Amino acid sequence: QNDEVAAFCQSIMKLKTKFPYTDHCTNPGYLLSPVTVQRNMASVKVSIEIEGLQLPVTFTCDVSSTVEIIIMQALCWVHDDLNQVDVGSYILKVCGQEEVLQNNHCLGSHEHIQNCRKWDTEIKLQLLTLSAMCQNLARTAEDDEAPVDLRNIKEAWTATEQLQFTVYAAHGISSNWVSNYEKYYLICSLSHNGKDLFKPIQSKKVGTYKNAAYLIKWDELIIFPIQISQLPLESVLHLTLFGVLNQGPEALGKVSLTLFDFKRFLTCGTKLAYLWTSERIVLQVDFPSPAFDIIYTSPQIDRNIIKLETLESDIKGKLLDIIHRDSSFGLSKEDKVFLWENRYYCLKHPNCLPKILASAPNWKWANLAKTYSLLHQWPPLCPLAALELLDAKFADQEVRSLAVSWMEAISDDELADLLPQFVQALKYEIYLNSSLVRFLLSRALGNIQIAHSLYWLLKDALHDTHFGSRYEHVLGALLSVGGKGLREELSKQMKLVQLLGGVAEKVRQASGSTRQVVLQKSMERVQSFFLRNKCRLPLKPSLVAKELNIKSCSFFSSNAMPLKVTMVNADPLGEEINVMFKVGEDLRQDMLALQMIKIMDKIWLKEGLDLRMVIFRCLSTGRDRGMVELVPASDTLRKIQVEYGVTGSFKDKPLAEWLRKYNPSEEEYEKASENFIYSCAGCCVATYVLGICDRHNDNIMLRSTGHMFHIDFGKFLGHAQAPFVLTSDMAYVINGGEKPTIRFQLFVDLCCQAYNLIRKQTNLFLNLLSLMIPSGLPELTSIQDLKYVRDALQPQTTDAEATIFFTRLIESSLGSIATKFN
């Protein structure tokens, strides 16, 4: 471990050398404003503050214009000719947010622009030079030159010795264990590619040793029916410790051991493993210790150039049927062998390589040379497709390194929203230094948003009972390489989340009349914090808070008593910061639901379908606590139904009247109704595919602009289970009347269109969810959960039949009032 850590640190300094503090492109010192490229790149109004002008210039821009020419248009308003105006010295930033628009991207591609348009709120930018932009987070020269802190040989293929090891003892047993358990045993399993190579082997059941209740001694030899020369390089031994009660046996802990170390040497001699149960226990397994070191050597390369082969059409039809399948999921055994034999015909369809590798008959050393030979004459995959190659089922390091090399094509903006799965895929790298971790660290060096999100994600990952140590090394590398500016900023944000969490705990423990007073008094400590510190908001680190608005702070009087934290912007050009902080309930599953909704939205927008979706932020900042974006001027459907229900008996006019009071004019009410149509279509498709069937008056929320969204994702992937529901007031808003109109047909067409656009990306959604399996969410625990989503996506069906299917889902959701529609 120490020597692996040292080699890791050497490599990481080598990675640092490639990001000097002088290069502004990779060391900007500011956040980049996020972008999601949208097709068909319509006009909007933008107001731009300019130095020397008392009023900002306001003018109409083409949504499809790049930020560069928009800067020049703003410069043209103030100068008659740009001959001696330093045009390249200028940037645009969002008013009140320390994020900079990206020059080479369309104004319409930027998320801030897109939200403002959905919102119809003022686009308020500011023109300045790089010199005036805050670059406090930038790395110094100091940081660059600082160090990072966190005899004979036998080739393995010639090694005939059985794999064998002696499970010797476990040291450190607790008093609670001695009282509750008589005896103990280990179950030993041997795995590669996340799959058992053989039946697991169970040890004898022994009690605590004589005159030692902290010691469990087995001194037992365990032999597996395999030789050293048959072990894949990435073979892992799993030891799970069990306790049989004295008064079913229950699992006390688990350790894993790689059979080869990061330098290809076979594990030899005594080896100590550590398992935690809350405390640390030490297992000792003794491996054989011959007079020679055994090293793994990969088979030697095949050089081949493979256009020159048979053809046929009974076979070629079946083959292209396999290639265009949704995924490798559920691929039958016959299909696997058929594809494997025909694999060299597939070379002009790169994104089917994961199917091909999943159809390999085995990963025996002898069969590796022909796989490797294929892999290095294979075309580049698209990054999203290469995700599958980083899942558990592909442990081979050539495969994974090659997948990371294909991943390098992905943009930072796309990668930012996929980081959770990458952090999880770290668990399938057996060694500390890997292509993948260096890729992630490299991206975090060149982009502050990626570094910030990686920070918070690794910080959750630390609570893993099995992988926490590895994540500590990775997080220490991120913090080391990030520089002192970023480090002190993250420290301020960490202290802020701790202080806010303390306030929330005190508020919940307090009750009734002594609760808001407890709030106000407990916020004193955070007020002190701001008195000595200006702090970036962890949810959106481009917002700088200087002070707490103690007056507007309150609680929501709901389950888990959430805090409404109101903060003063440090920028006068910006507006208040309002975030909810919540303690008690686990926000990671809400984060996964939100991320899936965001990815569906991205997919739609890339195909030119804008369903006007509400995409709000949520950040787990610890064990069962975090902070959540607050969508302004929105209320739950029941709240609307009942506040209307005191004045009316109409059954179906509450939502329409609610929207009418905030959109009185006819143009404004039609616009709000249209927003409702589109956002509701998006919500229905998401409800069905992601299996969120807990929808009810309290779960669905509606914004005064007319946009509908979800806020609670308690039953997520609950496909056990009218998938969604369309009560009559929603139908009234969509129709505009009490009878069906062409607006309902537009809603049905929008739903089916979006549904098919997601069915086309079934592989991405299956891969994005399986990569989250090992994160430990209660109800994404197996590949079976993925099967339910795939069945919902109906992969085999055509787009036309899928349209028919979803249309009848809609009319099922309409219930009794579905008689009135065609």
Which of 295, 324, 358 delimits the end of a domain?
Answer: 295
Residue type, 738: E
Helix H or strand E encompassing 469: helix 468-482
Residues 369, 300: Cα–Cα separation, whole Å: 7
Question: 294's torsion region: left (phi>0), alpha (psi -120 to 50) or beta?
Answer: beta
Report residue 511 as tokens: 């009750």
628 with 769, same domain: the answer is yes
- Provide the number of structural domains found in the chain: 4
Experimental technique, in short, is X-ray
The CATH number covering residue 69 comes to 3.10.20.90
The domain that holds 741 is classified in CATH as 1.10.1070.11
Four-residue CA torsion sign, 410, 415, 418, 424: positive
Q: Give the C-alpha separation, 33 to 31, whole Å.
A: 6
Beta-carbon neighbour count of residue 1 at 10 Å? 10
Do residues 767 and 802 both lie within one domain? Answer: yes
Residue 343 DSSP code: G
Do 655 and 640 touch, CB atoms closer than 8 A? yes
Which positions ≥6 away from 461 have C-beta within 8 Å? 423, 424, 426, 467, 468, 471
Tell me, yes or no, whether 131 and 254 share the same domain: no
Q: Where are the beta strands (DSSP E) in 141-249?
A: 152-155, 162-171, 181-192, 195-196, 201-202, 215-227, 236-245
The residue from 440, 463, 485 where one domain ends is 485
Contact present, 545 and 569 (Cβ < 8 Å): yes
In a domain, 710, yes or no: yes
Beta bridge partners of 287: 269
What is the C-alpha to C-alpha distance for residues 778 and 318, in angstroms, rounded to an integer? 39
**Interruptions in the chain after residues (C–N over 2.5 Å):** 41, 150, 247, 278, 306, 721
- Give the span between the Cα atoms of 197 and 224, in whole angstroms: 10
Determine contact, residues 178/213, Cβ cutoff 8 Å. yes
Same domain, 627 and 736: yes
3-state secondary structure (DSSP) of residue 294: strand
Measured distance CA(457)–CA(518) in Å, rounded = 32
DSSP string covering 638-675: HHHHHHHHTT---SS-HHHHHHHHHS-SHHHHHHHHHH
Chain position carrying tokens 């999943």: 358
Distance CA 577, CA 650 (A): 39
H-assigned helices in 23-152: 67-78, 111-119, 141-145
Do 245 and 348 sit in the same domain of this protein? no
8 A C-beta contact, residue 433 and residue 399: no
| Measured distance CA(195)–CA(208) in Å, rounded | 32
| SS3 state of residue 462 | coil
CB-neighbour burial class of residue 172 (10 A; exposed 0-12, middle 13-18, buried 19+) = middle
Q: Are residues 691 and 756 in the same domain?
A: yes
- Tell me, yes or no, whether 568 lies in a domain: no
CB 308 within 8 A of CB 314: no
> In terms of domains, do 645 and 753 share one?
yes
Residue 523 located in a structural domain? no
23 assigned to some structural domain = no
58 φ, ψ to 5°?
-120, 125
Residue 226: which domain range? 153-295
In the beta sheet, which residues pair with residue 167? 220, 285
SS3 content of the chain, % helix, strand, coil (to 5): 45, 20, 40
Q: Where are the beta strands (DSSP E) in 456-543?
A: 535-536
* Cβ-contact 705, 672 below 8 angstroms: yes
Question: Among the three residues 272, 295, 318, which one is the final residue of a domain in this structure?
Answer: 295
Closest among 665, 707, 688, 655 to 789, alpha carbons compared: 688
Same domain assignment for residues 781 and 647: yes
CB 156 within 8 A of CB 266: yes
Asked whether residue 390 falls in the same domain as residue 291, the answer is no
Give the CATH number for residue 272.
2.60.40.150
425 in a structural domain: yes
Q: Is residue 570 included in any domain, yes or no?
A: no
Buried b (16+ CB within 10 A) or exposed e, 421-454: bbbbbbbbbbbbbbbbbbbbbbbbbbbbbbbbbb
- The answer on 281 and 346 residing in a single domain is no
Query: Which single residue is written with the structure tokens 């069937």?
Result: 693
Judging by DSSP bridges, how do beta strands 162-171 and 215-227 pair with one another?
A: antiparallel
Tell me the residue type at 793: L
**Which residue's structure tokens are 């095949």?**
302
19 CB-side CA count, 13 A? 25
Are residues 746 and 766 both part of a single domain? yes
Q: Do 639 and 716 lie in a common domain? A: yes
Of 454, 455, 382, 392, the C-alpha closest to 418 is: 454
Whether 76 maps to a domain, the answer reads yes
Neighbours of 358 (CB within 10 A): 18
Is 39 within a domain? yes
For residues 389 and 423, the answer to whether their CB atoms sit within 8 Å is no
Q: What is the CATH number of the domain that holds 452?
A: 1.25.40.70
